[PDB]
């Protein structure tokens, strides 16, 4: 199907005399494939997928140099931001960015992305056209002007349409056994009385990959949108994900409820019922 490559970057200044910390994590869909971290004491703290290890030192050294240089850019960014926002040098602040590309099943580019946040609030992002900036805050007008004078959108666009797509296609092939395999959810339905008038029906989904899933509860074929409780999708710790949807139903009316499970790994969607 379709695939995405994303890098999730963080640069954080720290309390007192503490050195800033820099991290870059690359994902293909929900699979982490590389991690660069200034806190890393050895290659073990910069884990990488086996299909990245196979690229050898030319790849690793080139990406390590890019990370090291990007860290110099982020140090200046952190200093400029404290100036824009009239903040003390003593504070700890966080700069993050997410960037990368989406391709269809044929490998053709669908969309490029490049967004930045400061202290967890959107700051500036490349528009979908990859030719202009959208500024979330007043101060981002300053960055936008500097980036217009330096033709940064053209450079980011070249990477997003070119390098990003070519390498995403390469990783999908080299890591095909893990990246192109969709694990369907393992499902079940549990019942939990709450009172002598009502009970909770909980629809479970475990062991699925990718994280994207749709769990709905229906009454007589009708969607129960307002009354469905959905937990945030959570990692199992083995690359798979978990989620549940719950509905409070009247005692005796459980046969009227069905759980609908939609996932890319399923040949056909599931319709589930409580089976005592």
């Amino acid at each position: 199907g379709s695939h995405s490559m994303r890098y999730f970057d963080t640069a954080m200044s720290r309390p007192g005399r503490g050195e800033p910390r820099f991290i870059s994590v690359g994902y293909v869909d929900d699979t982490q494939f590389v991690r660069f971290d200034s806190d890393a004491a050895s290659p073990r703290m910069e884990p990488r997928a086996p299909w990245i290890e196979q690229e050898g030192p030319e790849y690793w050294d080139r990406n390590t140099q890019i990370f090291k240089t990007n860290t110099q850019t982020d140090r200046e960014s952190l200093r400029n931001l404290r100036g824009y926002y009239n903040q003390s040098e003593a504070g700890s602040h966080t700069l993050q960015s997410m960037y990368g590309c989406d391709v269809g099943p044929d490998g053709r580019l669908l969309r490029g992305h490049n967004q930045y946040a400061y202290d967890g609030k959107d700051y500036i992002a490349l528009n979908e056209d990859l030719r202009s900036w959208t500024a979330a805050d007043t101060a981002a007008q300053i960055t936008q002007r500097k980036w217009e004078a330096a033709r940064v959108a053209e450079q980011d666009r070249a990477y997003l349409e070119g390098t990003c797509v070519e390498w995403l296609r390469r990783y999908l092939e080299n890591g095909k056994d893990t990246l192109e395999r969709a694990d369907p959810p393992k499902t079940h339905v549990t019942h939990h009385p709450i009172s002598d008038h009502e009970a909770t029906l909980r629809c479970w989904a475990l062991g699925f990959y990718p994280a994207e899933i749709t769990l709905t509860w229906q009454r007589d074929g009708e969607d129960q949108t307002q009354d469905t409780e959905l937990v945030e999708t959570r990692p199992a710790g083995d690359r798979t994900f978990q989620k549940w949807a719950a509905v409070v139903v009247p005692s005796g009316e459980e046969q009227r409820y069905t759980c609908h499970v939609q996932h890319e790994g399923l040949p056909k969607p599931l319709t589930l019922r409580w089976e005592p």
Binding site: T69, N70, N80
Partner: peptide, 9 residues
């Protein structure tokens, strides 16, 4: 493959 960023915020 990482993107090289040179221009600061």
């Amino acid at each position: 493959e990482l993107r090289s960023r040179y221009w600061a915020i």
